[PDB]
Design a protein around this ligand. Structure first.
Ligand SMILES: [Fe+3]
Ligand SMILES: [Fe+3]
Ligand SMILES: [Fe+3]
Ligand SMILES: [Fe+3]
Ligand SMILES: [Fe+3]
Ligand SMILES: [Fe+3]
Ligand SMILES: [Fe+3]
Ligand SMILES: [Fe+3]
Ligand SMILES: [Fe+3]
Ligand SMILES: [Fe+3]
Ligand SMILES: [Fe+3]
Ligand SMILES: [Fe+3]
Ligand SMILES: [Fe+3]
Ligand SMILES: [Fe+3]
Ligand SMILES: [Fe+3]
Ligand SMILES: [Fe+3]
Ligand SMILES: [Fe+3]
Ligand SMILES: [Fe+3]
Ligand SMILES: [Zn+2]
Ligand SMILES: [Zn+2]
Ligand SMILES: [Zn+2]
Ligand SMILES: [Zn+2]
Ligand SMILES: [Zn+2]
Ligand SMILES: [Zn+2]
Ligand SMILES: [Zn+2]
Ligand SMILES: [Zn+2]
Ligand SMILES: [Zn+2]
Ligand SMILES: [Zn+2]
Ligand SMILES: [Zn+2]
Lengths: 178, 178, 178, 178, 178, 178, 178, 178, 178, 178, 178
């Protein structure tokens, strides 16, 4: 993918004379950086979305979901600083302003108050299906671009996302969940 | 302030029949909820902004500022869940989507790559002057609205913000910082 | 409120010659001590009530409520020794015998075996609505009586009680909870 | 002893269809349950009594006794939840309301302010003599009723109570303690 | 109170161009800063005084008082850095030289060797009566000066000082303490 | 690469009868072992070099660099025992004598006293550029030699080295660093 | 390999409507699931076998081997839940009944009492040679089946197994071990 | 057994007026106290003996036995204070002077330097056979004397001693141990 | 040196009958006590001085020095209670009132606000040169006075002070530090 | 002093061929070993004596002394293994049988039950005066015998013993202690 | 000894204007610095040598020696940074490049693969005999050169080295170790 938005190696600015793409060729950096910026915005958006649903859930599954969402945040949270800094280490600049989260994330954070357990869980399962396949695909893309290092990070993140996807899909595989 | 955007006690939705403003009158809730939604969006925006500057700083003050910004995040971070849940406990629904952060935060997160130490620090000092006065003013407003409980939370947050403001203002009170 | 039952500064007994109300006038002590004795008996009664319901709950919400009640006890428990000793520090003597708990608590502990989740949760939500408003009102009363110190303790306890009230009210805001 | 007050296996209520006395015959349950309800009420009453004396002690032995009573509470406190739940596991329902504590406890909690060290310590030593013999006797009774499991719990509790009894008896074996 | 001795916002010196009183007006800063400098010098003086008495106590209450004084130091010690830095955050400069401690503290540190338990304890109880009322009064003064933030700090410190005052007053309320 | 210096599977010595290359063919072992011996000597040399610069740095960046070098040692240090033992597990014998470190390391440890911050940092950045590319290349070589296991170790080490490279390059991207 | 025994995506049962193979095609799932079920049964069998030998070893190497086997269990044990849940996350159902362990494990647990150190160690070294090559081969198979995520798990497990293999092979490379 | 040497309930001395045998009859105390004094002296003697052998062992089993003896001390050590205080709680006075250890211990501490592994281990196995049977027999004796409390302590100590006996017997069941 | 100010063995006061100089002759005590009182006052003065500079530093080296001064306080702080109590153990009474700190300390605490990094660091380096030589000289003096015990304490304190001296001297060995 | 009883370098026994006195001449070893065997037996005897008095103390100072004796044991206990092993490292064999403790200790463990606080404390103060001077003298003797290493150990032990001596002497410097 | 190689106080370089020998005369620094550089190179060489033997040991004593060498590294490792920084604090510059380790160490690291337990242990015992005497001699030399501070460091290091020497000498004092 195209990564000009995340590339900091060609800026006209102070304290930037040494920035480069280390062992990656320019086109390889473009491929890898598009995945890192997208996955960073996605991870931050999942933190915000798990919190919004943690705060808004009501009804008899409140303890099940309120506590689960915090456990899932704890699993994914460290990857925010790690993905941002992998991008910086390769000569990028990570984006984290609200407008940039909205543009590059594959996950949308709700603006409405969603009380219903099934509505929350089905939304999250759809997101996590996309994000876990995303990391598997992005791992292969990075390996192909001669970046097995970023690929290895993604292999670990995909295992975590796939695990959370299973747990949430299991909870909603029940006709008595309204 | 007006707080319709944060008020969840009158929604037409499921699992919402019991939501109310507890011991606050409606107008008192409006006053307190405007402060909680604004301060929540501001705190999350400060987390994102301290991270963006942590990731982008370069030059000879890199260790000073990279490490300081993480210490400041650790001081303010717990207040994200606390402020959101104080709003929920009073019959509100906290907003955390990117569009809502941008609308209600008193702090803007950078979309550009800022390498320069002075530029980062002066921006943050301006923000923290506004946010610390904000919590002092909002504490008095909440006390006046018969909510000494939220006021007490704000008294603690203001002390933290004022402390961080001093440290950053001190670092930039130097003509040799370019 | 009247606090003769809690006042230890005028006793005819040994090792009591120095007991006084420190910086409070007698009438100020009466106001503050009535709130401390009542809130102490209430807090101990909530410990006993959360335990009784923890021990007696049955049915499919057993894990949700059994575990939640212990988390809520852990939040409120430290305030037992703190409220009792604030009363002692102001020249009072805290009461903790069963007959005194029953007389002064605003919360009644069940003598029957309550298996039903909704019955337990609705009872607790009614209690916590009363106790959280109680601490907000008692904070203002203490501040008015020139005791901002006890008021500050109450501001923290009210935030905890209000949080627990929200979580329990959320769980029961569901027609499928029988 | 008779245990109808603690027996939950025959209730006319919801979510109670499966409750039974596990491997104990009905008469064996009656014997064991009388000991568990009495010892539960006694243990909670000792927590309340050690606290009341911790809060009220004055004079030159204040540090000796204030700190000792908290160490003794820490030793006995875990047995509250353990004894209540052993009773639940055998098809009982434990009682913890103030009126039930007063009825079934072998220890009375003071309603007066006792400043005098000797008065407190002699009262506690009398209580602990009764409670430690109680657990030794109740252990033998439970073993005889084919419940070596509850007996084993009591053997451990008796060792703790007997140890605390020695320490308090030692402190008061002194004519200079007024 | 007058606070010129603690005010750093008008100095003729290097690295001081940005120093100001944040959200406080000049007269409000004068009120708050007088309380912070006085309470800082008082807290440091209480650390030194509790140590001097810890080191010099002899006789049969040695363990009671030697250990208690260290527990009381541990309770008050963190407030030294906190009060000094609240003053710095508001545009002050805290004083800590011996001559400044002696001038501004409301507590005098002994220059003589005091072996006698009663003499030590009565001296400390007089000090703590003054210091606990001081924090209650200074809290109200700060609130009136539109600084609820510093007031909140003082509310917590007063509760700690009042607790220590009770424990020491209790120990000496005994005719057999010589 | 050629690895006879590290191969222990053909020695004429005691307690060596069972040594073999496990699932690797001889030529595959030669490829993988050359990378492990070189990276082991390099890692130990980086420990020694970060220490020498930690001990010798002087001037106004002393705290920045003295502390950073210890944090970087803590990140890389565990890989010394891990790389040596991966080589042993594949039928090699790791070298660690000074003469062997000097021969096989891609990093040279200074014999002179280097006080100058820029001189130290530029030297380290050159080293880490070589070592991070080295691990990326060696990962691909190991994967090609049917050793994805050693490759995975290298993917993690490369991410650490690349991160440290960024931080040091950032510090020196400043004309005011002399 | 064929994996019908582990595939849960086509069951005729309740709460199973959503089960699928996520981002893997059916044939890819068959390949990966055969490796996960086999490695799960193997890992559990190694836990049981290391325990049986830990319990049965006698003679002068008792401390060497009794303690080593527990350290090796601690290294491999977490991979039991991890491998089972990777299989569940991909739409499988892991098998753990004794009959299924015996069928699918590549390691057999002893039914006899083996006192002899050499007999135990040689048996384990043969097992670990097979299991470490197994994980290397299964990693490559999973990567080929577009599952780099499971492959990455296996790369870590192989390094652990290969390390344990070396230590046990070393201990028995000695003619004086009878 | 006869226990006059350990009985403190009939002394002609100060601060001893309240000492009694709690719930045991005099003859029951004699039985139980003989076991407690003997087992106390035995446990202290095993601490001294395990240390002497830990300090004196030489030869090729040095690490096996030096480290094992410290692990065995850590298992038995807490029972020194526990057995002594059970005796005090029942109106006894525990003996610990060297002459009393020698008289009442069933284990003799070496006065010679024993370098030989087999000699040490065979000596310890003989001791532990006696001490583990001793605790089993003493448990039954205490139960018969209406002291199930002390019996329970002994049941736990016997399990520990029997475990250590197995490990040491295993090490020496080897003709190659010289 | 002369130590009458610190000598408590000849006081006309209560609870002082047993005070003596243990194994030191009177003149030996005078030598050792002069060093302990001086070093105690010096250490407390260094705590106060490091804090004053920690609180007052401004400009671009704020993080370097603010954090360093707290690390140096943590290194020296335990020696306050240790030196005071070594003096008490030898029959002295340690002085800690402000007037006594000022008289006996070899380090003066600033009464002015010092913003300038170089001014602070040069002042501290001069102090630490004096204090580290002081402990080396006082160690030799104590050894000569037959007190190798106090000498050993001083050997450890000197190593700490000398280390801090190096770090601060290094930071200021730079012409660009203004 | 003469040390034949502790010298293991000339034994006629197995596994003893390499034992020697390391860097000490024979006469130097004799001097140092006499001090180590005596101080080892003394330290173990102080552990036993502090325990006997901990177990036997009664009357109103029970908490003061029961708890203090355990704190003093915790301070001295590590020196048992350290002194024994310093002797082993120099070619000695440490003695720990009861008969050897009695022969070489400078402290006698009571065979009687001592309830009286003053009697216990005065006995201990006499012991600790002897033991602290002993370590000071033995430190000088070891230094003179070219063993500054053992001397350094003794300097630390003397400081601990002297501290405990002060605390116990202080407690008994009181005519009201009977 | 001569120490020009380690002396940094006379360099012609930047940021070195303030370097001096603190309280030591030039000739005293030469004596002390020769010992510090030699002992630093020796300690680092012992880390490398213990690792090489840890990695290469095979045969039936593998667990005994593999684990022991890591415990010995953990004991000596902290002295690397401590000895290097004592040299820096006295105006030296410590050497750590491979060529400098080889020149100044009294211990040689093996370049060959040594499988044999006796060969490893005998080599280490010879080294540790030299290094422990070295620290005893260097302690006396430093004391004579008016550096009791460095001498004290060496007294502690010698005790550690002498302890490790005993343990290794004990293991090899056995004819059955081949
Ligand atoms: Fe970061
Ligand atoms: Fe990986
Ligand atoms: Fe939350
Ligand atoms: Fe507050
Ligand atoms: Fe309390
Ligand atoms: Fe429970
Ligand atoms: Fe038991
Ligand atoms: Fe601070
Ligand atoms: Fe800096
Ligand atoms: Fe290792
Ligand atoms: Fe699991
Ligand atoms: Fe072994
Ligand atoms: Fe004890
Ligand atoms: Fe102290
Ligand atoms: Fe020392
Ligand atoms: Fe006391
Ligand atoms: Fe030991
Ligand atoms: Fe260092
Ligand atoms: Zn680019
Ligand atoms: Zn509303
Ligand atoms: Zn009153
Ligand atoms: Zn029944
Ligand atoms: Zn001003
Ligand atoms: Zn080969
Ligand atoms: Zn399928
Ligand atoms: Zn008797
Ligand atoms: Zn004197
Ligand atoms: Zn000899
Ligand atoms: Zn020189």
């Amino acid at each position: 993918g195209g990564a000009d938005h995340a590339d900091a190696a060609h800026l006209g600015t102070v304290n930037n004379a040494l920035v480069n793409h280390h062992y990656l060729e320019e086109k390889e950096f473009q491929t890898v950086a598009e995945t890192l910026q997208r996955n960073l915005a996605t991870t931050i958006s999942l933190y915000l979305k798990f919190k919004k649903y943690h705060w808004d859930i009501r009804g008899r599954f409140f303890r099940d979901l309120h506590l689960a969402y915090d456990e899932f945040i704890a699993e994914i949270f460290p990857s925010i600083d790690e993905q941002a800094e992998r991008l910086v280490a390769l000569g990028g600049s990570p984006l984290a302003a609200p407008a940039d989260l909205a543009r590059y994330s594959t996950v949308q954070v709700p603006q409405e108050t969603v009380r219903d357990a099934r509505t929350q869980v089905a939304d999250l399962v759809q997101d996590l299906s996309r994000v876990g396949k995303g990391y598997r695909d992005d791992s292969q893309a990075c390996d192909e671009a001669n970046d097995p290092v970023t690929a290895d990070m993604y292999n670990g993140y995909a295992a975590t996302i796939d695990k959370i996807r299973w747990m949430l899909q299991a909870i909603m595989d029940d006709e008595r969940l309204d």
